[PDB]
Design a protein around this ligand. Structure first.
Ligand code: TNH
Ligand code: TNH
Ligand SMILES: *[C@@H]1O[C@H](CO)[C@@H](O[C@@H]2O[C@H](CO)[C@@H](O)[C@H](O)[C@H]2NC(C)=O)[C@H](O)[C@H]1NC(C)=O
Ligand SMILES: *[C@@H]1O[C@H](CO)[C@@H](O[C@@H]2O[C@H](CO)[C@@H](O)[C@H](O)[C@H]2NC(C)=O)[C@H](O)[C@H]1NC(C)=O
Ligand code: NAG
Ligand code: NAG
Lengths: 534, 534
């Protein structure tokens, strides 16, 4: 050994950089490779492990982001623009980032972040995913992995071994492997690794909890606004086949064999794949993505619901939750009548339209039930109600009810569940009032940005961020977000019988029960039963 | 002419009796025949008109009640016992009763009452149907007809002319004919006849509004807690056939022809028919009756819904409404978990049971939708909620939503609609708190019993009765329950656009809109659509 910023791993040596944080400093190691570049012929394949290197890998700057579609709806607007790649995209994007306390701990708690973005987008290197605040403030080692999104990560021709499906998940698995293997050298305790993530990252987390090949490589888990059974999170192998074929068909490929097709898709430049990515969708829809995990028989041995039922999953502690207004962002981008700069009150006819796109797989009787459950018939041309009703349809259907079924099935077999409902709307939020508490807007609180005065949060917003960070980290370190025998208010355990949960906001903690049961009984029991019979 | 109590009609002379009322007196003519006894061979046939008589028919005492099943669930208990025949039953029961002001008016407004009782029971002669208070207080001529209930009134073998169906309705028609023809001699104005009725009588009223052969014989109409499209009010000709056959089968009849069967059913004593009346029902159910009107092609030319749609009905003014807790009486008598002497809180499993019996014609997905619409899933073992939820299911499904669809269809084509929601619970009510405001308990207020001090109502209950009687009679006399240019609060007209209605109770009038729309959209639009597809 020689110095604080030089760490030797099983893959080689690695030189970090000293990084400032809230009038102190910590070490940071950025863009460490954990896989061979999945380039040329390796596109669509499994990740291979990174060949070890001689010399000193310079880990002082963030790596390239994976190739992905780029938001251009509000150019220069920070609200949308903060989610885009802030680094040059490249297929050579399988790297991770480590923030580490100064001085180097010996065996501290590890937290590994898994970004969202519908499995079609996402970056480890964004500002909101910066781990220096969490690492500093809570004394954890913070890791952010990456994984291939889009067709590059999720094109599935089941049966073929060139493009099996799921490889973006295997990407994440392998970075977890790499942490299990090397994190001790950074002072991490590999027996005490929490994976955590939001959206597609929250569903990923749950996917690793479900998948055998992934369960041994982490200790605990946090799922934010996503769960592995969301209707957008996975597709049958038949559906993925259809879609890969349809992709080939948009690029004038030979389709008569897996071999010809893959060969063709591999001839292509990345942006050509992205240019037609969205055209493979079976339905006109929102909150649906083209290349997602497949239920293959390997990564997932059986269907998800049967795995949840039969207890076939890792049994450990989990902490998860949702945000008040999960759906708003989807309707803004994808639904008639919603604009960023307007109150977006919605005609009844735009309502009808919205429902159709929000529950794409529904026959007419379906749409009638969904519409009936969500319409105050005493006051049905209220455009605020129509607006807000549809907001809720999207979030209930896509995020909250799937998470709530996940929770109920998991807690039968598990060892501890802590549920939250995050409903603070930030004082500095650039988006309009109507979108409420938006998909992804608990993140900044999880990653500590309210402590950075220049980002202009309130003090009570700072205080909520420190509270949340300490819930998240205490939980990662112990299986419980509460600190033993302390005067603070207690986040009760969530149990099959009483179903408790807490709001997360600036007001004194309040405990509640049965998070959106009424609606989620509609989405999780009745609707599905109705579409099965008809 | 000779005296106040001797009236000469087209059928003969008739001697009334002078009857006391609230420290005054009026004339009354009871048990005047309007049809030949439908006895022996005439059983199940059309009514023939009464052969005129010589001499002076003694109209001083009530007639016989029609043959009918008799309530014995609470023997001696006045609550149930006040609905039973208070006169000897006989098949020779086609008579009417007339209360007339003293002195005899020359051309006053006429009101003709049509009793309820599921078309299986009812009497013109009950205490609550006594017209002397209404006649005296409001200066109307009050008529009460009767009609055959049970198989005697409603056995249907469509195609046959011995037992066509519907004859109990023709009974009522004929008493209306008789009023059109003779009421002038009692000082009634035959151009100004309101028919009115409750339950099966309310549905009858609407049935005469719908039926061509009946529409010319009245001016206006009031429907209390019933409407002609209630699901218990009518059956197909196939269903009525099945049921008449099944009746024969319970009495060991020959079933190979209409002729043999009818011959057989006519051999029988009345009580034999009543003894097995209830065994013909297709389903285990509540709020369902064995012999009811059939949709025959004659009395009703086409199906009810098509008649309502196409405007094929009498266009005049109507005044109608419902009571807060229509269903309670049905669940008391017919549903597990409900007792007269208990708070009747209901297990969830008794709930399930209740729903099954309340919506008999529902497949499992039906029962799931009904259960979902009516269960607070935040608090689902609340036995008061389960009790009250099912109360509402019965009243919504059977009384309120059918009336609300009737109203909406009628008001497109009609000339004035006045809707009420009667929700006063009487201070002297003998039934328990939980049954709330019960099916048939607006009647006593319509017939003025609160003015009779010895019945122990409050003064504000007296005042509500006088108010209601004057709404009912002003409406019969004018087409509007409101008196021109008067300081009183105004019962607004009910219109397609704004759907207004008033509560009827002791508190100052309150106007509302859209009576149980949310539920009735479930019952009138969605549920039926759901059972049609599945
Ligand atoms: O560029 C276009 N569409 C881009 C669609 C990509 C959307 C990226 C999503 N990024 C977000 C993400 C999250 N929340 C958001 C909240 C508000 C806005 C964006 C959020 C949370 C999960 C990570 C991504 C386009 C298409 C057609 C016409 N005009 C623009
Ligand atoms: O006798 C039995 N059941 C009789 C069923 C007949 C029910 C007659 C209905 N009479 C009522 C009627 C109305 N409201 C009522 C409210 C409370 C109670 C009775 C009401 C209003 C419409 C006219 C009839 C019986 C059956 C089996 C076991 N125990 C008793
Ligand atoms: C999680 O699992 C642990 C052990 O697998 C549980 O701890 C045990 O609880 C049982 C039942 O009360 C006790 O008899 C044992 O003594 C406990 N073992 C240990 C080592 O403490 C624990 O209850 C589970 N926690 C939850 C929240 O389900
Ligand atoms: C009921 O019908 C009568 C006539 O059939 C309506 O009275 C007419 O209303 C029209 C339209 O406003 C006027 O132009 C006529 O002058 C009225 N005729 C008479 C004789 O007054 C009445 O509007 C209808 N009422 C309701 C409540 O629909
Ligand atoms: C590491 O690389 C960066 C970025 O290109 C550079 O600024 C820095 O000086 C480098 N340091 C070493 C030791 O290579
Ligand atoms: C009318 O009949 C009743 C009842 O049977 C009787 O009390 C009364 O005296 C009779 N009067 C006449 C005139 O027949």
């Amino acid at each position: 050994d020689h110095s604080e910023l030089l760490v030797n791993t099983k893959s080689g040596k690695v030189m970090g950089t000293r990084v400032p944080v809230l009038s102190s400093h910590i070490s940071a190691f950025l863009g460490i490779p954990f896989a061979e570049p999945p380039v040329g012929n390796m596109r669509f394949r499994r990740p291979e492990p990174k060949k070890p290197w001689s010399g000193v890998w310079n880990a002082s700057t963030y790596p390239n982001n994976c190739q992905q579609y780029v938001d251009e709806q509000f150019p220069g607007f920070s609200g949308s623009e903060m989610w885009n790649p802030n680094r040059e995209m490249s297929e050579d994007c399988l790297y991770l980032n480590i923030w580490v306390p100064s001085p180097r701990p010996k065996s501290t708690t590890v937290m590994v972040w898994i970004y969202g973005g519908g499995f079609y987008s996402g970056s480890s290197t964004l500002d909101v995913y910066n781990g220096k605040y969490l690492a500093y403030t809570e004394e954890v080692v913070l890791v952010s992995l990456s994984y291939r999104v889009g067709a590059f990560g999720f094109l599935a021709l089941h049966g073929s071994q060139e493009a099996p499906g799921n490889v973006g998940l295997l990407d994440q698995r392998m970075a977890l492997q790499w942490v299990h293997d090397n994190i001790q050298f950074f002072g991490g305790d590999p027996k005490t690794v929490t994976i955590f993530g939001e959206s597609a990252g929250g569903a990923s987390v749950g996917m690793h909890i479900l998948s055998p090949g992934s369960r041994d490589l982490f200790r605990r888990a946090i799922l934010q606004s996503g769960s592995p059974n969301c209707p957008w999170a996975s597709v049958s192998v038949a559906e993925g086949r259809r879609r890969a074929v349809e992709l080939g068909r948009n690029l004038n490929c030979n389709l008569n064999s897996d071999e010809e097709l893959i060969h063709c898709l591999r001839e292509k430049k990345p942006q050509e794949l992205i240019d037609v990515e969205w055209n493979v969708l079976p339905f006109d829809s929102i909150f649906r993505f083209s290349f997602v995990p497949v239920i293959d028989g390997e990564f997932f041995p059986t269907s998800l619901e049967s795995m949840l039922n039969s207890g076939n999953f890792k049994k450990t502690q989990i902490l998860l939750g949702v945000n008040k207004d999960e759906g708003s962002f989807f309707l803004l981008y994808g639904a008639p009548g919603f604009s960023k700069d307007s109150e977006s009150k919605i005609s009844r006819e735009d309502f009808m339209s919205g429902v159709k796109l929000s529950v794409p797989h529904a026959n007419d009787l379906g749409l009638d039930a969904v519409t009936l459950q969500y319409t105050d018939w005493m006051d049905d041309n209220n455009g605020i109600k129509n607006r807000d009703g549809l907001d809720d349809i999207v979030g209930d259907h896509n995020v909250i009810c799937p998470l709530m079924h996940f929770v109920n099935k998991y807690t039968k077999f598990g060892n501890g569940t802590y549920l939250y409902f995050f409903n603070h709307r930030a004082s500095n939020l650039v988006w309009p009032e109507w979108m409420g508490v938006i998909h992804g807007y608990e993140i900044e609180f999880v990653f500590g940005l309210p402590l950075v005065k220049e980002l202009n949060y309130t003090a009570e917003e700072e205080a909520l961020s420190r509270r949340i960070m300490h819930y998240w980290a205490t939980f990662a370190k112990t299986g419980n977000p509460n600190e033993p025998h302390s005067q603070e208010s207690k986040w009760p355990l969530f149990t099959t019988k009483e179903q408790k949960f807490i709001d997360l906001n600036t007001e004194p903690m309040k405990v509640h029960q049965r998070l959106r049961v009424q609606m989620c009984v509609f989405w999780n029991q009745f609707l599905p039963k109705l579409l099965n019979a008809t």
